Amino acid sequence: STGSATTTPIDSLDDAYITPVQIGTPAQTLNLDFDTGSSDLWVFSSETTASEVDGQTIYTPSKSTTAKLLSGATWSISYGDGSSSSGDVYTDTVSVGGLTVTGQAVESAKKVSSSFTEDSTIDGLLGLAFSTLNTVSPTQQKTFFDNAKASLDSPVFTADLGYHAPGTYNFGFIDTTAYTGSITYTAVSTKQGFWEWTSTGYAVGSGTFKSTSIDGIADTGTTLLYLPATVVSAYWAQVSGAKSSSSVGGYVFPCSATLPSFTFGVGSARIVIPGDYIDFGPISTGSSSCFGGIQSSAGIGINIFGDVALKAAFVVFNGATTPTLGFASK
Ligand SMILES: CNCc1ccc(C(=O)NC)o1
Numbered sequence: 001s002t003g004s005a006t007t008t009p010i011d012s013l014d015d016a017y018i019t020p021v022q023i024g025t026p027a028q029t030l031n032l033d034f035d036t037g038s039s040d041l042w043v044f045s046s047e048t049t050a051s052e053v054d055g056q057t058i059y060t061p062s063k064s065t066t067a068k069l070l071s072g073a074t075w076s077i078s079y080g081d082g083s084s085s086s087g088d089v090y091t092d093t094v095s096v097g098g099l100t101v102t103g104q105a106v107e108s109a110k111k112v113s114s115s116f117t118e119d120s121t122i123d124g125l126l127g128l129a130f131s132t133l134n135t136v137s138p139t140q141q142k143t144f145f146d147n148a149k150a151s152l153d154s155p156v157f158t159a160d161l162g163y164h165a166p167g168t169y170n171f172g173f174i175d176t177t178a179y180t181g182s183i184t185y186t187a188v189s190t191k192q193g194f195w196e197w198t199s200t201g202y203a204v205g206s207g208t209f210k211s212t213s214i215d216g217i218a219d220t221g222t223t224l225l226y227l228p229a230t231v232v233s234a235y236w237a238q239v240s241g242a243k244s245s246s247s248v249g250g251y252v253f254p255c256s257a258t259l260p261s262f263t264f265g266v267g268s269a270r271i272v273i274p275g276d277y278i279d280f281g282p283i284s285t286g287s288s289s290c291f292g293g294i295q296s297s298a299g300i301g302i303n304i305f306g307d308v309a310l311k312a313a314f315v316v317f318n319g320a321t322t323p324t325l326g327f328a329s330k
Contacts, residue, residue, distance in 0.1 A: 002172035003099025010121040022095040024064030030123035035221030039133035042107035043124035055120030105141035133193035161311035179314035179328035184269035205260030216303030226297040251292035
């Protein structure tokens with residue numbers, strides 16, 4: 001089997017991407033944030049505290065003839081941005097882009113933190129990291145990908161995120177029309193439950209490539225690119241008037257600037273992030289200070305190849321017995 005679904009930016013900055021997901025019978029379609037940095041499929045629901053719902057589409061398990069309470073199961077998750085959610089669990093039929101899993105754990109939110117309530121565009125998350133990170137207790141549950149894997153033509157999914165444009169998530173096949181040149185594959189460690197890999201280095205604009213190992217995670221659920229402070233300082237030093245602002249919480253730059261590109265290594269290959277991808281717009285409406293898309297990972301404890309980096313590539317999440325990542329230009 002295969003599936004193919006379009007993923008669409010939630011706003012003009014590509015702050016996140018939403019993908020429609022069919023849950024239950026008859027189908028209830030929710031727009032979920034596909035997150036390769038977490039392993040829970042959770043939704044706004046008929047159980048969510050009413051004051052914490054503001055415009056989201058909700059899953060109502062009592063309206064699904066295939067929904068079954070997973071008796072005794074709870075979940076509770078805290079993300080790297082300080083957001084959180086928790087609740088109970090149903091199993092139900094979940095389809096993405098024509099690919100159907102029966103008996104998928106659908107984690108129904110009873111509580112969500114303010115950032116989720118305040119974002120009317122995201123109806124929940126679909127985790128695509130390794131199932132070892134799933135929070136359901138006392139019986140840990142599998143991701144949608146892990147449950148689909150055996151049925152797929154090839155045990156893979158791909159992320160093809162757009163810059164200010166829709167893109168695609170494919171499951172079970174590699175669309176050889178969606179990228180240029182060849183795919184370069186690189187080793188993955190699953191020891192922390194992430195798609196963790198080691199970049200071979202970086203360049204700033206037209207500068208020389210610096211060969212240096214950068215361990216990090218391919219994370220579709222993180223907006224920006226978070227890298228070691230040395231690398232980030234070297235990038236922003238090439239932008240007149242850029243500075244790290246403790247009050248704003250990262251590097252800012254004059255909105256009048258033209259940003260240089262950023263290149264990262266994948267083995268002997270190179271992925272170029274155009275400068276425009278690194279512009280996240282005014283810090284507040286009408287400000288001439290703009291927020292940078294490359295930020296320090298210092299304090300986070302891990303480097304994160306988020307959407308800024310991933311949207312410059314066609315990315316293969318290879319879930320073979322030994323997982324690997326693939327990157328192609330496009
Ligand atoms: C786990 N991937 C999605 C997500 C939630 C919060 C964050 C984050 O803070 N990244 C820096 O990422």
